[PDB]
Amino acid sequence: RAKAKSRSSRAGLQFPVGRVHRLLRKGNYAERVGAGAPVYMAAVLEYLTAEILELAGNAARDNKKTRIIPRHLQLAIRNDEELNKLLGKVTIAQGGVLPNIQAVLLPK
Amino acid sequence: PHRYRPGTVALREIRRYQKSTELLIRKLPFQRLVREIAQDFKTDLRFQSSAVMALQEASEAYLVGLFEDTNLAAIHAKRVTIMPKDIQLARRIRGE
Amino acid sequence: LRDNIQGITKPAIRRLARRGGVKRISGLIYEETRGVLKVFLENVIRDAVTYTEHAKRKTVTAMDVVYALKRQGRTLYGFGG
Amino acid sequence: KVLRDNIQGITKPAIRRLARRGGVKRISGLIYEETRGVLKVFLENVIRDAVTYTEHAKRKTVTAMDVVYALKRQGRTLYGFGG
Amino acid sequence: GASKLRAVLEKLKLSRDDISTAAGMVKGVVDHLLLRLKCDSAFRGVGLLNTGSYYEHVKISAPNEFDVMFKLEVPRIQLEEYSNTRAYYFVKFKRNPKENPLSQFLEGEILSASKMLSKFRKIIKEEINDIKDTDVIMKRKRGGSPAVTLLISEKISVDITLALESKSSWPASTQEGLRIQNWLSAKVRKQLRLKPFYLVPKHAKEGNGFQEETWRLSFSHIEKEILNNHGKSETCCENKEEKCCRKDCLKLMKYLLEQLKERFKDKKHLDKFSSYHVKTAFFHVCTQNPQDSQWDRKDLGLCFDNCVTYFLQCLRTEKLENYFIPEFNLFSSNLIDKRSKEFLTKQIEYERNNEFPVFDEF
Amino acid sequence: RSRKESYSVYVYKVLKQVHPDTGISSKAMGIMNSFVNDIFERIAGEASRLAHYNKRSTITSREIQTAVRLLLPGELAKHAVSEGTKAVTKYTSA
Ligand SMILES: [Zn+2]
Numbered sequence A: 001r002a003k004a005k006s007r008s009s010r011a012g013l014q015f016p017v018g019r020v021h022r023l024l025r026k027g028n029y030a031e032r033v034g035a036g037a038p039v040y041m042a043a044v045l046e047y048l049t050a051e052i053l054e055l056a057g058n059a060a061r062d063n064k065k066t067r068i069i070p071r072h073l074q075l076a077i078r079n080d081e082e083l084n085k086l087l088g089k090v091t092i093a094q095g096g097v098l099p100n101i102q103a104v105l106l107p108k
Numbered sequence B: 001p002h003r004y005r006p007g008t009v010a011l012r013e014i015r016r017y018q019k020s021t022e023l024l025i026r027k028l029p030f031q032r033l034v035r036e037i038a039q040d041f042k043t044d045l046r047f048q049s050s051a052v053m054a055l056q057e058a059s060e061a062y063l064v065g066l067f068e069d070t071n072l073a074a075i076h077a078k079r080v081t082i083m084p085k086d087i088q089l090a091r092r093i094r095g096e
Numbered sequence C: 001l002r003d004n005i006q007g008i009t010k011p012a013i014r015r016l017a018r019r020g021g022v023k024r025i026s027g028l029i030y031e032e033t034r035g036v037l038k039v040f041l042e043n044v045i046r047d048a049v050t051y052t053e054h055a056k057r058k059t060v061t062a063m064d065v066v067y068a069l070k071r072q073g074r075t076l077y078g079f080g081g
Numbered sequence D: 001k002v003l004r005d006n007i008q009g010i011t012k013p014a015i016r017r018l019a020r021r022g023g024v025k026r027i028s029g030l031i032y033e034e035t036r037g038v039l040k041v042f043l044e045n046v047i048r049d050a051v052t053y054t055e056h057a058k059r060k061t062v063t064a065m066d067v068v069y070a071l072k073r074q075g076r077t078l079y080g081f082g083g
Numbered sequence E: 001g002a003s004k005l006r007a008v009l010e011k012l013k014l015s016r017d018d019i020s021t022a023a024g025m026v027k028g029v030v031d032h033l034l035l036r037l038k039c040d041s042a043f044r045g046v047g048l049l050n051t052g053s054y055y056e057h058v059k060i061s062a063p064n065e066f067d068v069m070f071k072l073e074v075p076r077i078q079l080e081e082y083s084n085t086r087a088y089y090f091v092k093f094k095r096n097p098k099e100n101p102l103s104q105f106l107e108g109e110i111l112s113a114s115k116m117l118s119k120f121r122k123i124i125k126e127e128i129n130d131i132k133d134t135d136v137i138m139k140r141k142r143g144g145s146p147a148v149t150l151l152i153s154e155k156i157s158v159d160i161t162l163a164l165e166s167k168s169s170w171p172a173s174t175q176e177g178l179r180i181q182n183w184l185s186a187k188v189r190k191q192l193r194l195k196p197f198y199l200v201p202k203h204a205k206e207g208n209g210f211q212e213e214t215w216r217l218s219f220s221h222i223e224k225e226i227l228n229n230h231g232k233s234e235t236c237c238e239n240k241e242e243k244c245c246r247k248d249c250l251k252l253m254k255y256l257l258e259q260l261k262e263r264f265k266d267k268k269h270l271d272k273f274s275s276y277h278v279k280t281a282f283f284h285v286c287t288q289n290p291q292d293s294q295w296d297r298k299d300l301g302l303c304f305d306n307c308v309t310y311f312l313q314c315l316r317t318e319k320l321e322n323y324f325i326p327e328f329n330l331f332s333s334n335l336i337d338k339r340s341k342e343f344l345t346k347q348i349e350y351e352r353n354n355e356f357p358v359f360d361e362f
Numbered sequence F: 001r002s003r004k005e006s007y008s009v010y011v012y013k014v015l016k017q018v019h020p021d022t023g024i025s026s027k028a029m030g031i032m033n034s035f036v037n038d039i040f041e042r043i044a045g046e047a048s049r050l051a052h053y054n055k056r057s058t059i060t061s062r063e064i065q066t067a068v069r070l071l072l073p074g075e076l077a078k079h080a081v082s083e084g085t086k087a088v089t090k091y092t093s094a
Helices: A018-023 A037-062 A070-079 A081-086 B008-019 B027-038 B049-076 B084-093 C010-019 C029-054 C062-070 D012-021 D031-056 D064-073 E002-014 E020-039 E101-105 E113-128 E181-192 E220-228 E246-263 E275-288 E297-317 E338-353 F008-018 F026-053 F061-071 F076-091
Strands: E065-073 E077-081 E088-093 E136-138 E148-152 E156-166 E197-201 E214-218
Touching (some): A037 A081, B027 B049, B049 C062, C029 C062, E246 E338, E297 E338
16 A cells, blocks of 8 residues: 555644544535635734734733733634734623723823 | 822722723622523523623623713713713613 | 622623723613613523423533524533533 | 716615615715715625636626625525526 | 053053044034935934943944934834845834834835835935035945944944844844853843844845845844843943953954954955954854853963954854854855955964064054 | 543643743633634634535635635634645645
């Protein structure tokens, strides 16, 4: 038998490809899953994951940390307008809120 | 007899509570509130501790978002103090 | 196990208001707030019970709460999902 | 040919009539412009999705269903034009 | 061998006690300039890197020569290495939804070093003409490391460097840099790397030409932190019980090079050498000699001699790794010709065999 | 024992590319897992509809692509499309 090779490595991805291929056939979403479907999707999930982690990582650095906590994810998501929206209905456990104080409440 | 003026502390608390992530509602009280509501649907019902927390965080998140809109309504009305009606307006606009 | 809405202390209410950016709170807010919180909880808990019942269980799990919240335009992250 | 400034195609009486249906009694002069800038966003979002659906299907002509899906996606359903 | 060196070091420090007024004039000019830059849409976010100071002296024997950096934040950048240079990159911006005001300096995808430097000096030029109490003249720019050189009356010069600030994790090419693990500790290294890194407009200098829109990595802020935290004890030298000669050796090394450069400024052999080369070699010697006891102040004479030897070795072998960018050879034949290195080697060896007379002669 | 699946291992790896020197709490990881499952379902869900609407039994890279455009807003949607389009182009070329 020819040597088996992981597909994630092959597609230049870190996210699993065969599995996504699989998951796309579940929940009864479509009878069949095309070969490029999970490849396309795995790239998307990985991309979005990176964007959140990068921004959260920057938040971690802003707070002089060596890691991401739920709070950093919240700050990252909200500061980034497009992620803010993508997850605009999402409640993050222990996310807190942005420190937005209305100007009319402040003295001179 | 040093004092900090009205609004100095209020702003301070706002700063802090916006910053922190912890639950603001006492737990045993909240837990019991959940149960009292639950018993109106069904007696002898149980909860995982994680379920209660999940409810509490969602509950606080809801109220905070509500208060943000309430605050805006009060400001629109040229007022700092929020009144029951400002809550009602915000809710209504939201479809409640 | 009655009127446990009063277990939501006044400071607890004010602190949430503060987090929301509220600087001043009318004396009639406490009660009005409760009348809203309660409805929120009623809607979420009940769905969780409905899911729990469907599944033929007695213990409400975090997942049943998540489904209840989810469908109201509120995905909650942290308890599984 | 290219079109332009049809935002003005939404005439002042048209805006007022909508406002009136909504229970608005009295309208500030700046509402007209402010309203258009909001209507426009709504239209942009719906039309775009309808186009996106249309393109996915590899068609050129937008049908009622493409609009219906677009509106459903934004969460405002519409009955009587398909479903 | 330490006594003569100590007299020199004391002398060099004391020559700066007169500076406070010169520093004042520099500050006057800098604050003035920052106001204009803040008025400019491109530099609206500009500020000093070395916060709390309007002065930083690169040359130990030039107390009237000042060096300041004006930093400008770049909220997200993508670096692209230029032609395997390892230290030079093109700067592009990542996805950014809102308007990025530095867009005016873009050329295609790339942030133009040429445009920013050109405009930076143009802004300062117009603004210095609004300095009324101090006479400030601008020099014509030649390179890109100092964006602007200002001439204050007939005594003071100020080199102004513009730098982009990035708060992202440092590029992988820096992964093995800041080689302080065996000297100042791995934990200090980790702490420093949680800090931002900088990019300075810099054409990719190479064998017979250069790239116009490249930016070079800069860790000047770390270098400052190291010089003032050169010990693994980290408070070594802030107390006489723990007084080492690392700082003293570097000043003497800088002084040796500066004195020789002044001595031979006319023969031009040494024009391309700078304190940064000395300092880079120095950090490496500190890395080679990580214990404070290898730098006991009592041993300044031999410590300095050993520092000199390492520097000579670097010149002779044409190798001096950037301390932060180990694949960047500061002493590559592409940046400095062999003749200059042989000359400096020879001059230093002469000085050293005669107990460094150039330290006294001027 | 029963066994559970997550993306924890893949999340770590991504974190390393953006921030090679940082880690992540167990909670942040739990959140990222909730996140991935949410996005997956939506895209797959919308892709399901597109296949249905256009009378198909199969989801291909296009249904995934269109679902992305409909779900993601502005430019974020684009990079996802670019990467997906490529990953398929590449997968069959790798
Ligand atoms: Zn020391």
